[PDB]
Amino acid sequence: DPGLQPGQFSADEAGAQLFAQSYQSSAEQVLFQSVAASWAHDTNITAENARRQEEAALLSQEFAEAWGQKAKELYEPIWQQFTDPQLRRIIGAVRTLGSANLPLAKRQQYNALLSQMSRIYSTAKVCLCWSLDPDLTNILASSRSYAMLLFAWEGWHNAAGIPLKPLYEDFTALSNEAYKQDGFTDTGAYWRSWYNSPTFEDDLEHLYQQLEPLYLNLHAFVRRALHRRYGDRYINLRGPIPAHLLGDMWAQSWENIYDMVVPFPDKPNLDVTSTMLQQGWQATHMFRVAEEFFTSLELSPMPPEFWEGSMLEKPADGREVVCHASAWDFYNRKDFRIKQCTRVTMDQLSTVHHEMGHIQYYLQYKDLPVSLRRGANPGFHEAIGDVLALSVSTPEHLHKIGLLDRVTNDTESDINYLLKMALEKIAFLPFGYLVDQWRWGVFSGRTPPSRYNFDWWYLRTKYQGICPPVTRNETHFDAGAKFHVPNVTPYIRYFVSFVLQFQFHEALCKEAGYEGPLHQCDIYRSTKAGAKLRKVLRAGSSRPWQEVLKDMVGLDALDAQPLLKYFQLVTQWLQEQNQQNGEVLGWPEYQWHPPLPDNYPE
Amino acid sequence: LDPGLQPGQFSADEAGAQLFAQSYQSSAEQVLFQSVAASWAHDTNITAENARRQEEAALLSQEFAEAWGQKAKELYEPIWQQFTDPQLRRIIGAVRTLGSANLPLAKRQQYNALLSQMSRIYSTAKVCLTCWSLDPDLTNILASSRSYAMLLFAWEGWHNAAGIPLKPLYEDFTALSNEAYKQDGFTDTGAYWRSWYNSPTFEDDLEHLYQQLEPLYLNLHAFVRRALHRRYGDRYINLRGPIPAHLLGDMWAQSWENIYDMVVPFPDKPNLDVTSTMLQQGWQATHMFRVAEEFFTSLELSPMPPEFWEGSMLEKPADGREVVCHASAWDFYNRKDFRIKQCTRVTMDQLSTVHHEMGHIQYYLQYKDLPVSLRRGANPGFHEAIGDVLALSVSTPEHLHKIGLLDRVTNDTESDINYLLKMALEKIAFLPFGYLVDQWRWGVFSGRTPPSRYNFDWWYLRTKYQGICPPVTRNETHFDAGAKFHVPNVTPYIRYFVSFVLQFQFHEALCKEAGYEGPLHQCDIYRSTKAGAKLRKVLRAGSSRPWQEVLKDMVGLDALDAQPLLKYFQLVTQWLQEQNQQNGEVLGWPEYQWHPPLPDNYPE
Ligand SMILES: *[C@@H]1O[C@H](CO[C@@H]2O[C@@H](C)[C@@H](O)[C@@H](O)[C@@H]2O)[C@@H](O[C@@H]2O[C@H](CO)[C@@H](O[C@@H]3O[C@H](CO)[C@@H](O)[C@H](O)[C@@H]3O)[C@H](O)[C@H]2NC(C)=O)[C@H](O)[C@H]1NC(C)=O
Ligand SMILES: C[C@H](N[C@H](C(=O)O)[C@@H]1CCCN1C(=O)[C@@H](N)CCC(=O)O)C(=O)N1CCC[C@H]1C(=O)O
Ligand SMILES: C[C@H](N[C@H](C(=O)O)[C@@H]1CCCN1C(=O)[C@@H](N)CCC(=O)O)C(=O)N1CCC[C@H]1C(=O)O
Ligand SMILES: *[C@@H]1O[C@H](CO)[C@@H](O[C@@H]2O[C@H](CO)[C@@H](O)[C@H](O)[C@H]2NC(C)=O)[C@H](O)[C@H]1NC(C)=O
Ligand SMILES: *[C@@H]1O[C@H](CO[C@@H]2O[C@@H](C)[C@@H](O)[C@@H](O)[C@@H]2O)[C@@H](O)[C@H](O)[C@H]1NC(C)=O
Ligand SMILES: *[C@@H]1O[C@H](CO)[C@@H](O)[C@H](O)[C@H]1NC(C)=O
Ligand SMILES: *[C@@H]1O[C@H](CO)[C@@H](O)[C@H](O)[C@H]1NC(C)=O
Ligand SMILES: [Cl-]
Ligand SMILES: [Cl-]
Ligand SMILES: [Zn+2]
Ligand SMILES: [Zn+2]
């Protein structure tokens, strides 16, 4: 389109001021038509929807090509030297073309692999048919039968991973070609550029080192409990934990096995799932309850377009959907939606808050020039709803919303709560860190196709201390059985969030005027904490996240002390328990795999 | 420190520096000698009393290094980098690096004790059940047994006996070493070891080299795996998995020359492993070293001096004494004493080792007149390549014929494949191992591999690069890296990777200088005084000039380059790829998790 193709403009700071306004003008329309078509497909997976999606992806590249080439022409000389930092941010972004740098037939091919990988992931079933969500999800969460958990884990990893591998290798090659033309050594380097930090990798590594003792202690304590349940045949007290026994397909959060490891067991059940079902909660209640938390802070309610247009339950009409929960900004300032195959569980209630966190962000920055309508970094975007969920999950808040009868504020209830929170937050950390370590090595060429599974399991064992419960080889592509890999969504943002949410939480609880233990704070109804959060959300990516962070929390860097201080009591406790059972921290028997159950699979 | 050994005063300028280096050189050689001598006494006669003496000599060295080091600092800390004299900058640059001399005395004593105990553990470890030593007993088993159970016994016995007791010492050594070098301004000890190559893209340069060589290795591996499967069967060899690490002829699987007889593609052609002929003919250690020497003199390089023949240890002592058997060359730094210590056995590969060690001696003879600080190879890989280049000529069929080791001469395509395959078992099979060892140790020095992952990371790398797997389960009580000499002995490894590449660049250049005009793999530089003069210019330089410029003068290129090695191997590279295809092989080891079962009723 002519009216989409760029204007003239002079080569100078002024000219560039007009240029950017012209850019963000036509981009609104283009982003709209992409986001719109992926939506049609994600909630209705067909050949046709795929075709449409590809058409839109092409139009985007054409736009990006035209506008990036123009910004090179005009500004490539002089843009790093404009006094205005907000402009410098916008122009640098504009001149990064991405898959737009590809010639046309490769542009095609890349758009198509995304579509087949997405389809394979979200339509894969396990047969003797069970889908990932809800069937395999519920099995992994609540079955305590070694053999059934095994059959779900293997069936899933085989059904999703095997067929994806050939496509993923093609995808990597195209993505790398594309980004090399913007001056990036490879795609991973581009993804990392989003944090604008020279010492990014080193910083993450220093963070992980302070967090590792917490995970090691939690792991040994949980390993001990799984040994009690499953015996020496299947659990090695000095070896990795079999990857299917931790309550989740990816072993990435362990809250579903809380009932097996709860430290003082007879006390009130801090998992309120059975009460939610007892009371008849539905998807709609969960969303309204999340919203009211938002509005209690004087943040924005969800608009009519959100309720009218979102998909809050898996459709009952035999229609393939991408189940994985997600939040959608259509770049209209009007349409914002969530697509979630919502189940009635306490962990889904948290997911609903996580997703609505994204929507709130999008409502707070909708009056920005498109290119500023991102989080200050991707980690910020992932942390917003998680922050509110930390207040929601407190026993006192649960009591306020009628899901729990008031607990006694004693040291045992503290420990039980902190341990549940550790199963969700600390257990996640190694997996949050390792996923993009795998994918950065793939994009760099350090991990060729001939080592995709070898390097995956190296990292899984290294960081999470888990092992595959059945033999794997390079026909298997176990990384491809996690959503974000075929769906090309970066992962390091979740490790950043998991640390960042504790920094935000402590800053918020301070603005709230709260004065007790960090892990007992509820910011519900604090207009002041709301005010501070609002300033973060409206800023989008106009400013450096380092400065956004300082204004918010008083420090200019990611920091583990808030998280450490939140969990201090359970950290101290777990250390004591492991000693008394004389545990080995870590998994020195690193070659150990469990045997197969007798005559598997029958 | 003895008064005559201590630094005086020198002005704070380049003219003071020169007098300083000259005064240092006078005292350094006495201090180097006492230290080398004490190491010799210990290594040829391992006793508590000898280790005590070596420890005291190492402390004296440290006192010397610290006094001359801190003086070199005090007077020249900035200005040394701006010296007009390049050799003087290199000398000062070395003197000002203190290493272990940076530790306070208590820690220096701890470090020196650790080195001594780690050396003693490795060089006195035995496998029991009447005791087998590594050399010759376990070496011979790995080389000639074809009994899966026997090889396993030797492999496991060794790794358990040497590795397990070393692990606590290695951990403490790593920490002290890093603490020492970090006061020289290095992030860790591996950064200091890498600085010897004076190349900011060193790690990337090596990775790029490795990428070009990897296909040759994968094809050699697959072909050998097939040969082992036909002998050991489907239970112990997985045609799509890593090879068990005790079946390749060598304790470390680091070179595969010993399974030549099982892989030779054309058995009707002359037998190129002449070990049996050396035995039939009655060769001893002394003949081996004299034949090596005569190659050097044929090139008009120097003979071994009388002090070499009078002082060297050329067989394992019969008199009942513990010795360090691993072969080594020794410069005493007095310009007079130069020695080899080798438990020589009468085999073709030992004849190659004789040449390797004599190449070291020849370098020390040619540079003996330089300042002590420049008595080193242009980089460490240069010192490792000298003897190997000559051994390339020696191993040729035509050369073996001239020295009475191979009666039949043939020049046809099948004999050439046999020869190039035998050379690939020696040279191409080593590459992955030569590359991986310091990747392991650089990770340990940088803290990426903590003690809790020493064996996990070691086997990750052994599988990744070599495509082998341990034949019994290992865990973190094992310390398999410690079962290789250079780990406990603290000798860096990347130099052998460098030298396996560089020796083909040197070979190509000396062949050309020799006037030789046929296939590169049939060249013998024997009796070429032109080739000798070109080599002599390298040897005479020591570390006085940047290795990149020495290389360029020699070979006409200023970088390591895989092209000469590819050219040498081209006929067998192509043959192995065609054979593996016809046989339907899988290149690589996609069943990465596979390990062989135990023999029924092992080890009874
Ligand atoms: C073993 O045999 C090879 C092959 O020899 C050649 O091909 C055979 C099939 C027969 O036809 C032989 O008669 C024929 O020579 C020998 O390699 C060859 O060596 C010759 C002699 O040095 C090489 O010729 C030289 O080539 C250069 C140019 O590169 C000229 O400047 C010279 O004047 C001269 O002609 C010939 O290139 C070379 N062939 C190959 C494939 O490199 C080989 O020397 C012989 N080896 C032994 C140990 O005897
Ligand atoms: C269910 C949660 N879902 C993701 C998500 O919401 O992050 C979804 C799918 C991938 C991206 N996403 C979005 O919604 C994007 N709109 C967010 C980025 C943006 O808006 O700019 C999740 O994956 N999670 C939750 C935490 C752990 C992680 C996981 O489940 O692996
Ligand atoms: C047997 C050969 N042995 C070494 C050797 O000679 O390199 C000996 C022991 C370690 C260092 N060394 C020396 O003699 C040094 N004095 C030489 C360096 C110098 O003087 O500047 C070796 O290990 N090798 C040979 C190639 C493969 C390697 C190995 O066997 O693992
Ligand atoms: C639960 O008990 C703890 C006592 O251990 C309370 O913590 C104290 O709370 C007061 C009031 O805010 C503060 O002044 C103290 O500094 C707190 N002490 C410590 C050591 O943390 C906590 O507030 C109680 N709250 C609930 C939820 O009942
Ligand atoms: C890879 O694995 C596939 C699945 O088979 C299972 O794993 C093998 C390794 C056995 O140990 C057993 O657990 C199962 O049969 C195999 O079909 C396939 O052949 C393996 N090899 C390759 C190269 O893909
Ligand atoms: C070995 O060393 C001891 C002292 O530790 C010495 O008395 C003995 O003579 C030495 N043996 C030989 C043969 O050098
Ligand atoms: C490692 O293996 C050995 C024997 O194979 C065994 O004794 C030991 O218990 C295992 N070590 C550890 C730390 O578990
Ligand atoms: Cl990210
Ligand atoms: Cl080296
Ligand atoms: Zn999210
Ligand atoms: Zn050597």
Curated annotation (Swiss-Prot), chain A:
Chloride 1 binds at Y195, R493. Glycans are attached at Q8, Q24, N44, Q81, Q116, Q282, N409, N473. Disulfide bonds join C127-C129, C323-C341, C509-C521. Inhibitors of ACE are commonly used to treat hypertension and some types of renal and cardiac dysfunction. It comes from Homo sapiens (Human). Induction: Up-regulated in failing heart. It is found in: Cell membrane; Cytoplasm. Monomer and homodimer; homodimerizes following binding to an inhibitor. Interacts with calmodulin (CALM1, CALM2 or CALM3); interaction takes place in the cytoplasmic region and regulates phosphorylation and proteolytic cleavage. Belongs to the peptidase M2 family. Dipeptidyl carboxypeptidase that removes dipeptides from the C-terminus of a variety of circulating hormones, such as angiotensin I, bradykinin or enkephalins, thereby playing a key role in the regulation of blood pressure, electrolyte homeostasis or synaptic plasticity. Composed of two similar catalytic domains, each possessing a functional active site, with different selectivity for substrates. Ubiquitously expressed, with highest levels in lung, kidney, heart, gastrointestinal system and prostate. This is Angiotensin-converting enzyme. The chain holds residues 31 to 638 of 1306 of the full protein.
Curated annotation (Swiss-Prot), chain B:
Chloride 1 binds at Y197, R495. Changing N475D: In Ndom123456 mutant; abolished dipeptidyl carboxypeptidase activity. It comes from the Eukaryota. Glycans are attached at Q9, Q25, N45, Q82, Q117, Q284, N411, N475. Disulfide bonds join C128-C131, C325-C343, C511-C523. The record marks N489 as: Not glycosylated. Residues 11-590 form the Peptidase M2 domain. Ubiquitously expressed, with highest levels in lung, kidney, heart, gastrointestinal system and prostate. Induction: Up-regulated in failing heart. Zn(2+) 1 binds at H356, H360, E384. It is found in: Cell membrane; Cytoplasm. The active site is at E357, H486. Phosphorylated on tyrosine residues on its extracellular part, promoting cleavage by secretase enzymes and formation of the soluble form (Angiotensin-converting enzyme, soluble form). Monomer and homodimer; homodimerizes following binding to an inhibitor. Interacts with calmodulin (CALM1, CALM2 or CALM3); interaction takes place in the cytoplasmic region and regulates phosphorylation and proteolytic cleavage. Inhibitors of ACE are commonly used to treat hypertension and some types of renal and cardiac dysfunction. Belongs to the peptidase M2 family. Dipeptidyl carboxypeptidase that removes dipeptides from the C-terminus of a variety of circulating hormones, such as angiotensin I, bradykinin or enkephalins, thereby playing a key role in the regulation of blood pressure, electrolyte homeostasis or synaptic plasticity. Composed of two similar catalytic domains, each possessing a functional active site, with different selectivity for substrates. It is linked to Ischemic stroke: A stroke is an acute neurologic event leading to death of neural tissue of the brain and resulting in loss of motor, sensory and/or cognitive function. Ischemic strokes, resulting from vascular occlusion, is considered to be a highly complex disease consisting of a group of heterogeneous disorders with multiple genetic and environmental risk factors. Renal tubular dysgenesis: Autosomal recessive severe disorder of renal tubular development characterized by persistent fetal anuria and perinatal death, probably due to pulmonary hypoplasia from early-onset oligohydramnios (the Potter phenotype). This is Angiotensin-converting enzyme. It comes from Homo sapiens. The lineage of its organism: Eukaryota, Metazoa, Chordata, Craniata, Vertebrata.
